Every structure is written in structure tokens, then in C-alpha cells.
Write a protein that binds this ligand. Sequence first.
Ligand SMILES: Cc1cc2nc3c(=O)[nH]c(=O)nc-3n(C[C@H](O)[C@H](O)[C@H](O)COP(=O)(O)OP(=O)(O)OC[C@H]3O[C@@H](n4cnc5c(N)ncnc54)[C@H](O)[C@@H]3O)c2cc1C
Ligand SMILES: O=C(O)c1cc(Oc2ccc(C(F)(F)F)cc2Cl)ccc1[N+](=O)[O-]
Length: 449
Amino acid sequence: MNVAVVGGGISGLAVAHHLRSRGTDAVLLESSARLGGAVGTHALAGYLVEQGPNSFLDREPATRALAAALNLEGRIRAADPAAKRRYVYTRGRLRSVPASPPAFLASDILPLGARLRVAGELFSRRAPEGVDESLAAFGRRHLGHRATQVLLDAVQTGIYAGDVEQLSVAATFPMLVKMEREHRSLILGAIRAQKAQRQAGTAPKLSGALSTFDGGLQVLIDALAASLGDAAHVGARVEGLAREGWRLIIEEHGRRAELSVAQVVLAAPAHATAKLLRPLDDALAALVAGIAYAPIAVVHLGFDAGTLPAPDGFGFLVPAEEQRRMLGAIHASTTFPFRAEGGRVLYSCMVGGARQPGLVEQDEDALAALAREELKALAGVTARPSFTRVFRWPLGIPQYNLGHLERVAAIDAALQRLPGLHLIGNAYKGVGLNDCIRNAAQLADALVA
Ligand SMILES: Cc1cc2nc3c(=O)[nH]c(=O)nc-3n(C[C@H](O)[C@H](O)[C@H](O)COP(=O)(O)OP(=O)(O)OC[C@H]3O[C@@H](n4cnc5c(N)ncnc54)[C@H](O)[C@@H]3O)c2cc1C
Ligand SMILES: O=C(O)c1cc(Oc2ccc(C(F)(F)F)cc2Cl)ccc1[N+](=O)[O-]
């Protein structure tokens, strides 16, 4: 009858909520003093600043179903007035990322032969057979070297803070690999997909717009916390589990307690879930423990109204070949004007990632100085900030590197030999908010069986 959920980030919260909304009592245990995990918005100095995540793409049904179940649909906010441009630092300046194929062919984002080579994606050679090919290898084959170096590397940085040479395209971009399987060429697949839809409606159509909530993504967290209420325990570290069924040893209020449930859902990060799995299956815990994370810091810089202009666009990204100490920045106030009061301008700068993890081990003063130097060199920002807030995440973002899918497949096969045990979270089948929520609901539905 009962389920324990371990971990209270978006995945754990969404699993417990979906179980309870279908009449399965779930208890959730969070080791921290607060729910949310990576998600957290802070009201400071006239800003709403985001701990980690800033937005979701309003294209996932599960996230809309969850907002509806939580009476949040009217609190969903779209991606700013202007602010539809993306920039990439390449060849000495911030350069606008073209949004259409005709704008791309006329653009200076890449040299002429390299743009012509992107059009030659029509003639892409077959994928290597039976090979878990990298993102960078995938790009060279489809796009050319220049487009991969600067453009695909940028896209990858904004989502995973990873290494383009190490990421599995099949794990990181399932839909690109599927289109490749069906159509070889991505351009061909798109032409054909447009033909298909243009040949022949109850619920409203999802815009795919870059979205958040009126008070940040904290609104979603506060709402899950209020929905679960007593069923979700804060400052409850799980330090053991074993068969009996399933018994959890919990450390709440500085003391030991025990809990007995029919089924356990582990929604903690790979390193923490591996620690719990070790006494049950050493080989399984090693698989789980082998999932790499990339460290990441966010440096928020607030500016008094008038001291600099409002930066155009959602933000910018910087390719690894540029050999810079910053990954990119939002443009938080341009994108979402409600997250800053009285004309104040907020940048949220991202530092670290897979290729420079050591920068995240620096102190906040040094990270703020780094962000200011880089923002000067790349964006031309000379003004002095009146606000500074640094968050460091050095358990960082899961890296779906070569061999990831076969790892997760072997993680799944080991879980079958352990009835009533289940994994969920950003480590396995999707890093983003939307993936976590969709995967969370899908597990919850399958448990009521
Ligand atoms: C800076 C950055 C920017 C991001 N931007 C975006 C973006 O804008 N869009 C997007 O879609 N995604 C974004 N993400 C990714 C996304 O936010 C995360 O993948 C997601 O929030 C992770 O949720 P989770 O529930 O799976 O894990 P977590 O949030 O890490 O939650 C796991 C929880 O389990 C707890 N725990 C660990 N051990 C125990 C224990 N033994 N007992 C009890 N509890 C335990 C931890 O305290 C933690 O709170 C971003 C991430 C980073 C950090
Ligand atoms: O969403 C992006 O792709 C984007 C992300 C940025 O910052 C990050 C946000 C989140 C992460 C994450 F998720 F990897 F932690 C990395 C970075 Cl560099 C900056 C700029 C952009 N952009 O499109 O112009």
C-alpha cells in the first residue's frame, strides 16, 4: 500500500504528488532543510534570483497537467517582450543566432563555405553502425566542423555544461537520432514532417515558449510542498535500506528512526543513491556511481537602473574553442521583466562545466571577479554591479557521456532482481525539469499496478 520517496527535488516531489493524487499514500524524505533540490528562487535586493534552473520550454504535456493539478496555469509566464534572439561569442564578438534557414544563409555567424556545408546536411553519410557516437562526431558528419564547433557546442553548453566530444548524441538528443534513423538527413526529415502535418484539436496548443512562473520556479516548489504537506519530511536523511518489503533507516531531528513500506523510490542524485544501493547490490551501485556530474556555478550580477543598458536577447553562449572562463549568461531581467523591480538589470552568469570543473572550487569573490572580467571582454560590460549572489553546484549536471544508454539499461536489468525498488531523477533518463516531471508521472502511473 505505502511508498517511500527518497529525495525532494522536482523528481521526488512529482512522484509523491502523482501517487497521492491517484490514492496511493506516499511519504517523501528530504535531507535538506528545504524542498526543491536544484530548484529555488530567492527574493533579494529587488530581484527574483534563481538558484539553478531558470525556465522550461512550454512544450511538455506532463508539465501542463501538473500545473493544472496544482492550479498554476494562470501563474505561468512567457519569455519577455523582445528577447527572442540568442547570441554566441565567436570570431571576436557576440553574434546573433539565426532563427530561420533564410536568415542563416545570409548570416555572419559562420563563414560562407561552412554555411554552405550546413545546407549539405542533405547529403549526410550513414550513421556509424552499432556505435554510440558522440555529439561532436554526429555534428561533423551532419553539419561540418564549424557548425559543430561553435553552434552545436553552444547548444550543448546551455543544456548540459558538458564536453561535446564525450556526450552521447543518442542519450542527449533522442529525437535527432530517431529522425536520422528514419530519414538519414535532418533537413529531409523536416521537409517530410512538414508534408505529413500539412495533411489533416480539443486541448489548447502548446507554444513551446521559454517559460517560468510569476514568482520564479519556486512557485512550482511551494505548491508541491503545500500539496504534500505532512507526507513530505524535511531534514530527514535516509542512511540505509534493506529487504524484509523495505525498511528505511532515517536520521531526523539528530536521532535514528525506522520506516517500513511496500516500495521504495530513490530520487536522490547518482552518488547518494549509489551509497544506499551498495549493501543490496555492489555491481548495481557501481553502475549508478559511475554517472559523471559536471560542477557549475551561477554568478548573479545586479545593476542599478541607468548604469548600463538592458542587454538584448535571452542571453549568450560561448564555445569551448574560444578558451574562455565563462560558459554564457542570461539576461534574466530582459527575458522575465517581473523578476526585477524598478528598472534593475540582472545577469546570471554560468561558470565551470565538464571542461573547467576547477573554477567552481573557487570562492565567491573570485567567481564574481571572473564573471565581471569575462562579461567585460565578451559583452563589453564595464559598469560596477550593486548586487552579487553566487551559487555553487559541484555536484553539477549529469553527463550522458558515451556508454550512458547501455549503463542505464544495465541499471534497469539489475533493478528487476530487486522487487519494489525504483530509480528516478536527472541522472538517468533526462536532465531537464520537463523530463523529470514526465518521467516522474510515468513511474507513478506504473506503480499502481
Ligand atoms: C545551474 C543549473 C541550471 C539549470 N537550468 C535548467 C533549465 O533552466 N531548465 C531545465 O529544465 N533544467 C535545468 N537544470 C537541471 C534541473 O534543474 C535538474 O536536473 C533537476 O532540478 C534535478 O532534479 P532532481 O529531483 O532529479 O534532483 P535534485 O534536485 O538534485 O534533488 C535530489 C534531492 O535528493 C536529496 N537527497 C540526497 N541524498 C538524500 C538522502 N540520503 N535522503 C534524503 N534525501 C536525499 C538532495 O538533498 C536533493 O535535494 C539546471 C540545473 C543547474 C544546477
Ligand atoms: O538555454 C540556453 O541554451 C542558455 C543557457 C545559458 O546559461 C546556462 C543555463 C543552464 C545551464 C545548465 F543547465 F547546464 F546548467 C548552463 C548554462 Cl551556460 C545562457 C544562455 C543560453 N542561451 O540560449 O543564450
